Design a protein around this ligand. Structure first.
Ligand SMILES: COc1cc2ncnc(Nc3cccc(O)c3)c2cc1OC
Length: 457
């Protein structure tokens, strides 16, 4: 009786993105053609909180649950290096990204969104599963269809896997975390808090607990005080604010349950004219742009560091293989070395690696059937990746620069690096090196230069 192997059943199609605990890859069943989203968790980056037996039983429960606002889990695999969580793929994108693409957004739209989130949470709580890490990135629209349901992803994972301590993994997280989670004694009510934070953001476009860096955010959360004194709260019903107050009640025993929040006047009224919350949409668009650029900045720097690491490793690997030291290896060798290297969730299969080597060889018009100058292969394969990383950062810079100025101001940098939790005198120091003219703004290239200096380059 033999243990099921992930790659015997599924082939990788493409990377969907980064989520909590790992990369998510669009895969396909090699027999049935079923497409799925597979979260690949590396045992080297992510430690388990529970034992094997506890995880296996949770997975077995999760597979049997079914609700229109919860991600479906189909299968689970484990091998020496990874866990694989095989789920249904959702293609409508993140909630907040759909919201900012509309010209209109009212309390009716927010109530219908929150009803869905509370409905999913209610179901999971009845089944004794807690999310703990509910945030906007965990709310995916099922498809691009006008009336697509919201699907909450990652329920139950935080019970089994330890959260990363790396800022590139923590972007966004502090705004939403319940104060009792910080102090250690928590239960399912933490999910109602996080929902309350999200609803506050839907209706005003600003986090209720904010600050200039991650720890300042956490300090505000822990104090637990917030207000509705912003001008844009004047546009909002008293019932919406009453529900928020109940969800952001500090002592969790006193906080409203998810199921009771579904019976709240605000949900009952607004989910059956109502003005558009235009200032809120404006603020959400800004919030989202900033969060996305900070994230892109951190991933860019991570990509540069991974390249410094991998380029020299790949070179030493091939140097060792080149037994007579003439610098030439054949394609089967390049594949074996690239394999020794990956020993990138999308490259955890021999066939995917073969395919990638062929893409690199074709890029440079190296003939695949003879012997190849390996140092040139390494350069090409790494320059491709450096080019890709540069292009992802740029897209995010252009998105943030919504007036098409070509520039990010000093004040905007302060906001971005604060979200990125890059030390203020540190980024200011690097800005003084780059901005020799006291223009107090940077273009894309200059911004990229700052990021390189903030990762030792
Ligand atoms: C299109 O973008 C994404 C689409 C996704 N669709 C479904 N699940 C995801 N994540 C997931 C999949 C399996 C288990 C799990 O806990 C979480 C997704 C992630 C995406 O990007 C990160």
């Amino acid at each position: 009786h033999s243990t099921a192997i992930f790659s015997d059943r599924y082939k990788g199609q493409r990377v969907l993105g980064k989520g909590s605990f790992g990369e998510v890859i669009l895969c396909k069943d090699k027999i049935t053609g079923q497409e799925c989203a597979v979260k690949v968790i590396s045992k080297r980056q992510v430690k388990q909180k529970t034992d094997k037996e506890s995880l296996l039983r949770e997975v077995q429960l999760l597979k049997q649950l079914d609700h229109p606002n919860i991600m479906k889990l189909y299968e689970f695999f484990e091998d020496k290096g990874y866990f694989y969580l095989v789920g249904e793929v959702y293609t409508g994108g993140e909630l907040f990204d759909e919201i900012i693409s509309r010209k209109r957004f009212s309390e009716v739209d927010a109530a219908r969104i929150i009803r869905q989130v509370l409905s999913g949470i209610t179901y999971m709580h009845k089944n004794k599963i807690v999310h703990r890490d509910l945030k906007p990135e965990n709310l995916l629209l099922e498809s691009k269809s006008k009336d697509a349901n919201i699907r909450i992803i990652d329920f139950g994972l935080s019970t089994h896997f330890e959260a990363s301590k790396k800022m590139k993994d923590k972007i966004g997280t502090a705004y939403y975390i319940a104060p009792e989670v910080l102090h250690g004694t928590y239960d399912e009510k933490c999910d109602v808090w996080s929902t309350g934070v999200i609803l506050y953001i839907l209706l005003s476009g600003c986090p209720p607990f904010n600050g200039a860096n991650e720890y300042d955010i956490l300090k505000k959360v822990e104090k637990g005080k917030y207000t509705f004194e912003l001008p844009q709260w004047k546009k909002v019903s008293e019932s919406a604010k009453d529900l928020i107050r109940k969800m952001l009640t500090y002592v969790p025993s006193m906080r409203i349950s998810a199921r009771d929040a579904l019976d709240h006047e605000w949900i009952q009224t607004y989910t059956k004219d109502v003005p558009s919350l235009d200032n809120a949409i404006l603020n959400i668009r800004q919030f989202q742009g900033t969060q996305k650029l900070a994230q892109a900045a951190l991933l860019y720097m991570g990509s540069k560091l991974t390249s410094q690491d991998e380029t020299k490793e790949l070179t030493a690997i091939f140097h060792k293989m080149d037994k007579n030291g003439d610098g030439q290896l054949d394609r089967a060798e390049l594949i074996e070395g690239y394999k020794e290297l990956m020993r990138d969730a999308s490259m955890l299969d021999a066939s995917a690696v073969e395919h990638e080597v062929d893409q690199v060889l074709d890029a440079v018009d190296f003939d695949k059937n003879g012997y190849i100058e390996y140092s040139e292969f390494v350069t090409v394969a790494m320059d491709r990746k450096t080019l890709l990383s540069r292009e992802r950062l740029e897209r995010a810079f252009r998105m943030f620069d919504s007036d098409n100025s070509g520039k990010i101001s000093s004040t905007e940098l302060a906001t971005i690096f604060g979200v990125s939790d890059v030390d203020s005198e540190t980024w200011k120091s690097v800005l003084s090196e780059v901005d020799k003219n006291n223009d107090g703004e940077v273009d894309f290239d200059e911004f990229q230069q700052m990021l390189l200096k903030l990762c030792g380059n």
